[PDB]
Design a protein around this nucleic acid. Structure first.
Lengths: 99, 63, 70, 46, 102
RNA sequence: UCCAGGAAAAGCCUCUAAGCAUCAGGUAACAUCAAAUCGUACCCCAAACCGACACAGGUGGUCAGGUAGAGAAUACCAAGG
RNA sequence: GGUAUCAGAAGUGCGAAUGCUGACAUAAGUAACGAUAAAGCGGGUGAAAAGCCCGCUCGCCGGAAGACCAAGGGUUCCUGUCCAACGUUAAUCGGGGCAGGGUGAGUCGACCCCUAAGGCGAGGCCGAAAGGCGUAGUCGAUGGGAAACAGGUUAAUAUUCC
RNA sequence: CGAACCGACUAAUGUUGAAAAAUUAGCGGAUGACUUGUGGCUGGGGGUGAAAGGCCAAUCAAACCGGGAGAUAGCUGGUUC
RNA sequence: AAGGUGAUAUGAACCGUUAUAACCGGCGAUUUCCGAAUGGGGAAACCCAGUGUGUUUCGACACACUAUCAUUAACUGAAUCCAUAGGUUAAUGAGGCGAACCGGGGGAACUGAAACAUCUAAGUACCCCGAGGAAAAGAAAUCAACCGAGAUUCCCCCAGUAGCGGCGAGCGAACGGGGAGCAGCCCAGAGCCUGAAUCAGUGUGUGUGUUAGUGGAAGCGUCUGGAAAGGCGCGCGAUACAGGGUGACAGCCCCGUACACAAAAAUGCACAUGCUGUGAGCUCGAUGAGUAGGGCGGGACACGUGGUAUCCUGUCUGAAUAUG
């Protein structure tokens, strides 16, 4: 494929947030703590080879940490990158381990 | 097994040595089950050898 | 500033008057150009006096065999 | 009334501070005397 | 530095208990010598806010400097400040100034 | 209508040069693929901004209901606060 | 931890310099609690309610004291919690503390094409050095270039999700 | 003529203020040498100035910051058992 | 080398005990984005392209190169035959940081003179350029005084002397002497001979340092006290009683300690070497012109034009050439 890129680890970690399970109509989607820079296309393909599910579309964004914490008074942000990404209907979680 | 082993394998096959083993970071590490009791953390305890391999390949450059 | 063949100057000095001025003096020499080389023909160097008179006892050639070489 | 300030990032570079410092003998000098002399965490641009 | 490894049966010196047995210990390179003959009855709160609010008022350690009765074979102390030779490849521990390696 | 006589460049349309020379390109119809990456929360005539303050001050633009009224005045009210 | 003695060397002795730093007085439990758009009551919760939640009244603003956005701010947003410090009082309450959660785009914006003022500027012209000016050219919006609406929905997102 | 908007003629209050120039009631301009957002250009003996030595970040008969610097002080103060 | 996964906190999950677990030292591998930042731009850590690549489910991912100057090389190449100007490519190299000392270009004022212009402060502050491990200076167109010394530099004297100076304030030498250190050589050119000493960059070796380390002595008792290193009794080491630490002050408890050993590798300096370039040595020659002087204006010499020598000069002139 044109797997030549970084399809290796563009995706990682779920989210099990409040949005989880609440965000399931015609198509369960997802979250994934996707790497800060995985783009949409790469994400679409990430779930292709792995998870073996059919992705319709991707979205993603950023969300930023922020907090003071220090030996006295400094502390800083953290940064992330959410990613909904939709799948389909005719294919459920199937043989897998939810969590 | 892993760790400094076949350090001469010119007929190398370092590929997909990462992802295939991604089970943890990729899967397991999600919630609960990345080895919770019997055998938890592996990555930095052993699967961190990814350097050794890519390092070697990087060394076996003058071939 | 130039007088290429020879160094130049532009060094400062104090221009005293009747006893004293702690002022400053400087910029000297001058310029000119368009010097016909017996060879092909003139590139215009901006020499000045002491530079112009130098191109005489000397050459025009050796007077240039430096602004090239070195 | 108008208290002499009024912020505007864009108006914080060539016009003042920021990275413009790297465009002048003194400008670049500031960085040395600032960082080096008395290590500053500094921050200039944000 | 300490060389005194685990199971190393030493004796108490310097003070407090003193003249006591104690062996093994849990000293470590730049670490601590639990031994066995150094520990007064102490206490634990209920750190774990959970069902198992325990305690631990029994047993614990009493660091104390590595400066304890050197291993000792016959009487006491008997400094081990000597070095064996041509044995092992890593080390070559010797022993008290009485005999040779032990 | 007047005198004080009122940006620029690109996209856009068009004309040809070199070049092309059954080709490529051009126009239209539809079929399909692509449209990446950042921002997006909340305050915003103010308790989140400029004034040391949960400061009777300062801060650009947008929207513009009813009765009365010349009215974005003013008074009483809607939605709302 | 200190140091007779005789000797040696001093950052060698404070009450003031509208001296410098810190701590504590005094006035004094005095003034003041920030727009004169005042609020009353019944429940709830709670150790305690004039102030918080619910309800009915009452009053105030309404070219706004409403709504939206830019600038700037940079989690202040929503939920749960806790009340030391912070709120000019009390505080169960908050823009406070600690946790979590929360901003989803081919059509909105920035990137991006284009250029304004102006900036920079190959070579170049100048100038003790630093450096100044400027041709090609390259940046620079506050301006010109392409395309979406109406319902619905979240505790919090929305011409982004359906 | 008169709202917005721009400005400040008068009085009271404030003067350890709500406020390091404002609040209240009046007041002047309000299609113009008008008013305002964004960004740009002029630098200290220098700028800008419908001119007051006005303005150049609560600083201006020569800005702020660092340096020469422990300037100089025939003056004032203080000087310890 | 028996432990160990840096710290504020364990804890979890673990790696190790013999010899590739730690940990220390050497050489490497990797080393995102920004920053001389160098592909172009840019409010620094962001944005956009060209041209090549591999794996390619063979659109792509990222990767890699592409700044500007200078030297040389070759190729192209205007007005104009030529030739240049210009252009392209390529290999070298620079570029930026850097504390002080050092050379150099530019250069104050407060201050003092009990005012202030000469004068001082001071060629200090500062700003700019450059280079080294030191830099700079340096083998007499030096000085001396009829005797002689013999490159530069740094130290003590000569001396607060001579002298300069509104002869004010103040500035302030040298000859000569005592020392640290101590060497002189090249081109200005041909021939003979002819790769010879001398250096420079480099691969190597040896010495001796730098980067981990190894061994390293000799104390019991009883007393007081929570605790002994302290009291008291006796005993031993000492080329070690520097010091630190240990539950009160220890030579003999621990780290050390004098002393005695030690380096795969990597480098500093030395010597030695090979390679490359350099060029020794003998003979006979040659012997630094816009220069020395000088007129004008200045600056530097302790020396403020003074009677002012000498040095550098902006500006204008301008010689002899070693019986010079």
């Amino acid at each position: 494929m044109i797997r030549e890129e970084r399809l290796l680890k563009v995706l990682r970690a779920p989210h099990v947030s409040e949005k989880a399970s609440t965000a399931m109509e015609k198509s369960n989607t997802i979250v994934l703590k996707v790497a800060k820079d995985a783009t949409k296309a790469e994400i679409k393909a990430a779930v292709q080879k792995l998870f073996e599910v059919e992705v319709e579309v991707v979205n993603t964004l950023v969300v930023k940490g922020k907090v003071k914490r220090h030996g006295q008074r400094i502390g800083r942000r953290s940064d992330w990158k959410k990613a909904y990404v939709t799948l389909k209907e005719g294919q459920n979680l199937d043989f897998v381990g939810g969590a | 097994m892993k760790a400094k082993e076949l350090r001469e394998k010119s007929v190398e096959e370092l590929n997909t040595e990462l992802l295939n083993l991604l089970r943890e970071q990729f899967n397991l590490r999600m919630q609960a089950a990345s080895g919770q009791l019997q055998q938890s953390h592996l990555l930095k305890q052993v699967r961190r050898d990814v350097a050794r391999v890519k390092t070697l390949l990087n060394e076996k450059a003058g071939a | 500033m130039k007088k290429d063949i020879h160094p130049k100057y532009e060094e400062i000095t104090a221009s005293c008057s009747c006893g004293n001025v702690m002022k400053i003096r400087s910029t000297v020499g001058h310029d000119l150009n368009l010097d016909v080389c017996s060879k092909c023909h003139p590139f215009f160097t901006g020499k000045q006096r002491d530079v112009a008179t130098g191109g005489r006892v000397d050459r025009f050639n050796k007077r240039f065999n430096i602004p090239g070489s070195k | 009334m108008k208290r002499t300030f009024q912020p505007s990032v864009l108006k914080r570079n060539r016009s003042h501070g920021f990275r413009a410092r790297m465009a002048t003998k003194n400008g670049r000098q500031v960085l040395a005397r600032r960082r080096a002399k008395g290590r500053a965490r500094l921050t200039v641009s944000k | 530095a300490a060389k005194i490894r685990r199971d190393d049966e030493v004796i108490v010196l310097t003070g407090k208990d003193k003249g006591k047995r104690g062996k093994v210990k849990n000293v470590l390179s730049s670490g601590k010598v639990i031994v066995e003959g150094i520990n007064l009855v102490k206490k634990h709160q209920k750190p774990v806010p959970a069902l198992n609010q325990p305690g631990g008022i029994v047993e614990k350690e009493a660091a104390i400097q590595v400066s304890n009765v050197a291993i000792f074979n016959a009487a006491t102390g008997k400094a081990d400040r000597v070095g064996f030779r041509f044995e092992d490849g890593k080390k070559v521990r010797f022993f008290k100034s009485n005999s040779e390696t032990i």
